């Protein structure tokens, strides 16, 4: 469904994606240990920290 970024995260290469606090996104998957998640926003796709996002509308 839809998630929202809790904090700002700036992309650092290695297929990561920058996300802004309050920005909505779709979660497409997770890495082996669940620490990183594949996100899709209006800016594209890339990995973002899993603990930086939460479901839109708690």
């Amino acid at each position: 469904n839809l998630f929202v970024a809790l904090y700002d995260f700036v992309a650092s290469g290695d297929n990561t994606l920058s996300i802004t606090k309050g920005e909505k996104l779709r979660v497409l998957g997770y890495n082996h240990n669940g620490e990183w998640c594949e996100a899709q926003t209006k800016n594209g796709q890339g990995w973002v920290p899993s603990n930086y996002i939460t479901p839109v509308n708690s």
Partner: peptide
Amino acid sequence: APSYSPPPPP
């Protein structure tokens, strides 16, 4: 996915 650790919450 990155092999390094995601930064902790600010």
